[PDB]
Amino acid sequence: GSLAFLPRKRAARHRGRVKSFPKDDPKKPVHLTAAMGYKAGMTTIVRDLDRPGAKAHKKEVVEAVTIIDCPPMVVVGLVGYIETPRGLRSLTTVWAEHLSDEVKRRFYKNWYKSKKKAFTKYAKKYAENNGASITRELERIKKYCTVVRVLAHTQIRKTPLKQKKAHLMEIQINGGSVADKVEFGRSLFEKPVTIDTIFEKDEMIDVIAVTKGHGFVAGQMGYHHRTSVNHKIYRIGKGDDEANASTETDLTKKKITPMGGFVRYGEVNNDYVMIKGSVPGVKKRIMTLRKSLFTHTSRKALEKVELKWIDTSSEFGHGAFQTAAEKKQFMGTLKKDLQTS
Amino acid sequence: DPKSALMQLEAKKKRLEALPEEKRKEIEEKEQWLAARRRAEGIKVHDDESLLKKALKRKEARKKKSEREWKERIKAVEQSKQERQRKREENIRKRREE
Amino acid sequence: PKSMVIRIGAGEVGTSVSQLCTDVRKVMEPGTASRLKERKANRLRDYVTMCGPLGVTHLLLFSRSTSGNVNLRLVVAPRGPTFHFRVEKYSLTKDVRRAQRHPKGGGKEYMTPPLLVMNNFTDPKSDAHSKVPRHLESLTTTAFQSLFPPINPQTTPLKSIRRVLLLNRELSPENDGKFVVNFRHYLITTKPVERRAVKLVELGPRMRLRMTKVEEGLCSGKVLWHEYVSKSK
RNA sequence: CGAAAGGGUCCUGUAAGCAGUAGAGUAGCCUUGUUGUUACGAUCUGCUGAGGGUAAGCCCUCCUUCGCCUAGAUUUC
RNA sequence: UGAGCCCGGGUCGAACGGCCUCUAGUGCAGAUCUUGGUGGUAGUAGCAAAUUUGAUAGAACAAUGUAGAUAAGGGAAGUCGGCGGGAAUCUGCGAGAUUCCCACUGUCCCUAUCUACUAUCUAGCGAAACCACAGCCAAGGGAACGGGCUUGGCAAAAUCAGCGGGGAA
RNA sequence: GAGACCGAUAGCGCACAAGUAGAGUGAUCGAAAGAUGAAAAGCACUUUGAAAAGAGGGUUAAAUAGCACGUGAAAUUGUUGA
Description:
This is part of a larger assembly, with chains A (341 residues), B (98 residues) and C (233 residues). Chain A has 341 residues and is α+β, with helices and mostly antiparallel strands. Chain A has helices at residues 101-107, 120-127, 131-144, 178-188, 195-198, 324-330, 335-340, and strands spanning 31-32, 34-48, 60-69, 73-84, 87-95, 147-154, 167-174, 192-193, 203-213, 222-237, 272-276, 286-291, 307-310. Chain A has seven helices and 13 strands. The radius of gyration of chain A is 23 Å and the shape is globular. Chains in contact: B-C.
C-alpha cells in the first residue's frame, strides 16, 4: 500500500478534523469556509452532458450521487487566533448566551445524571452587565488576532436520527479585515446559517469523513480519517419545497427520498446537498464539507450542470416505482385495500 | 461416571429381562412415569445407550491424542539431552585436537 | 425456569390461534420470548435446538388438525415429557375484557409471574386405582409446579404477588367425574377494608382441556396412557 | 425510551378449504343418459397481485397501545 | 595489613575457654561433585501415567480448515481431435426448417464426493527443558574477537495481538 | 573389660518398624527416619466452624517449649517502613 497512509491508524475523533483552511487575502468579501451535514445515502441521476470534446457530449449520462442531509447550523461562538513563532494559537474565544440543550450535551458526557450547570455563570456574566468583559474580549480579538473562526453546531433534533447530541465545529471566516470579520461573526451569533448561505450550486469542494471500519473479519483495517478532494455539488434541495427531487424535465412532485425512505437512515425533510460520485463514510455519519484550498484548473469545475431526474425507486429492493401515486395506479386495486375500503 | 451409568443400565436390563412379560410392561410403565416425574422436577437422568457409548468413545479418543502428545514431547526432550551430550563430546574432541 | 409458546404444531395459523398464543405468552411473562415470530419453514427440531442454548425448560405447542380440532402439547425441554391436551372450549382475552364490566389492562404486573393454584387433583391414594392417580395426576402436578418457578412463601414479596393461575380439575378422587381441566387467569386487587380484601379479576384466556395422551420424549416415545386406546401386554 | 399494532416498502408465488365433469383413465349400478350416477384418480379452472414473511445491522406513527422514571458502587482538586 | 579476636543488644538453656606442648578423618566456589532444602521459568504449558472399577466441574459448540483418495464436472496446456446423444433458435402437432458441443494425454488448477485429522471460555488441578549475570542502534575496538570499553544517536511505567533483528584439503 | 576413635549426611546398610518399607520373573538391589517438658501437669471450660483450622481461658520457670514440640542459620517468601 501507499506509504503516506501507513501504518493504519484509527481515527482519534469520530467527527473528523479539517486541519487546513484556504489561504486568506483581505480583498475578497467575507465568507465562511466550511459546513457540516450527515450522509443520508445515494441515488442515481441522468444528465445532459455539457463537456465539449467528450465522446458522450450532449448525451444522456447516468451517474451515482451522494445525498447529505444538511440542517441549518447555528452560530454559537467566535474564536481569535494569534500568529506566533510556534504556529497559530488560540488567543481567546467568546461564547453566546442561551446555548442550546444539544450543544450542552456536547459539553457533557453523562447528561441524564448531571444537573445542567455548564455555562450558567457565563450566561450570568452576559446578563449582569459584564458587557465590559464581553467588549473587552471582542476588542482583544479585533486588535491582536489575524485568524477568526466561527463555532457552529449542527442539530440532531432536526436530523432524523436516534442521536440527541449536537455536532460542533470551527469554521474560518475569510475575505476581509480582522475587524470586519469579527463584526460579521458578532452579527452571526444566535442565527441559523443555511447551506444555500455557506455553499452554492454546481461547485467543486472537499469532503472530510471517517471511512468505515471493516471489523470482525496486519491490524486495523478500516475506520480511517479521510479527506477526499474534488467532489462536485450538483444540487441543493430545500426540504420545504416537496419538489426537491423534481426537476424541470419531469414535473413529478416528490422529495429526494425514494419509496419507503432511505435504508438504515430514514427520510430527510431539510436542506440537502447532492454531490457526484462515491464519497467516504457511511450513513448517519457526520460529513464535513469545505472549500478547495486552490482555484480550480479544469472545466469539470465551472461546468454548469443540468439535471433530468433522480432515482426514487426503493433501494431496499429492485423496485421500479418512483412515486406511490404511480405505484397504486399501476398495480390497480388489491383485495386487502378493497376490504379496508 | 459413564462407566458407572453403563453398569447401572446393564443391571437394569438384566432385571427387566429376568422379570416376567406382563410385569415387564407393568414395571416399564412404572419407571417411565417416575422418569417423567424426576426429570420434569429437573433431575436430568443420564440413561441412553448411544449417548453414553459415544461419550466413552470421545474420552478414549482424547486419551489417545494425549498419549501421542506425550510421545512427541518426550522424544523431543530426550533428543535435547542427546544433542547436548553430542556437542559436549564434540568439544572434548576439539580440546584433544588442541 | 423458562417457557416458550409456539404454533409450530399447526400446519397453518389463524387469527384465533394467534390471539390465543399471544394471551398464553402474556400469561407466561416474564419468563417467555414475546418476540418469537413463527415461520412456516420452521420445525420442532429448529425450535428445540433454539431452546437448548436459550435454557428454556418448558414448551407449549398449539397444533390444529385438518378437522379443526386444536391440541395443546406441553413438553419439557429438551427430551420430554409430552402432554397432549385437547381444546374443548376457549375464549379470547379480548372477549373476556368485553364481557367484564370493569376490564383491567396489563401493566407493571408483567414483571411478576403468576402464582399457581391447583384444585381437586388427587395426589394421595384413595382407592388404590393407581393407574389414573399414581401415573397421570402426580405427573400433572409436577409438570405445572416445574412450569412455574418454585414459590417460597417465606421470601416472596406480597406486593409483587399480583397474578394467579387457576387449574381446577372437574374430577373426584374416587376416579368419578368428567376428567376436565379448567385453566384460568386472574389478577389480584388488594383493597384496604390489617384486614385486606382480595378481589380477583378475569384476564383470560379460559381453557377447557381434555387430558388426551402422553409421551416420554419430545413428541416421541411410547404411549404411556391413551384415554381411548389401551394397548395389550 | 422499548416491548405488540397500523401504514409504507421489498420477497416469493396465487394458501387452506370450498365450488367446477376440468382431469389420462379405471370398476360397478339402473327405466341406458347430446353436463347418467357411485367409488379411486397425479394434475387443470374461480374465490386469489392470492397466502405468508419483512430486522435479528429497512422506514414513519400523536397518546395507534401499553409499560420505566430523579437509580446504586467507587473515585477525583 | 590480613586470615581472625574481643565487647555491647536480643534469643537461649548446660556445659566452655586462654597458654605450653602432643595428635589428626583439621580450613572449599568450583570437580556436567554427594545429600538435603529452596527459586525463576509459572499459577505458564496442559487436564495427558501418577496423583469394586473407572472418573476434573460448569458454560458452551456442531464450525473452521488440512492431508490422502474417487471408471465426477469445469477451466487451462499440447497434439495429427472437433469443420448417435444433449442444448437451443426460426417458422406454420407439424419427415417441420436452422445453429452449438462430444478426442486423448505418463500435464496444471479449481469445484463436487469418500476416509482420516481437527474446538473455545470460566472455575479446580497443575509440571518440565533451561538459568554465571543481562539484552536498543551506528562507527571504533591489529589478531574477520564483542554483551565489556571509547565516541555518538538517544533514552519514560505496565499489558494483549502481529511483526523482524541478534545469539583447510 | 577398655579407647588421645565417630557422634545422627558421621559411626556397621540399620541408635528408631532394618535386611524393615520398597523394586525386580529371578539370582539379587535396598533406604529415609533420634531430642516437648523435671514431672503430661499433653491445654479444663466458653465461643467460631466440616478443619491436620481460630478467638478467648488454663498448665509450666518458660507454650514464639503444644506430640508440626532441646537451640533454630542461609537459600526462598509475606506484611509494614524508608
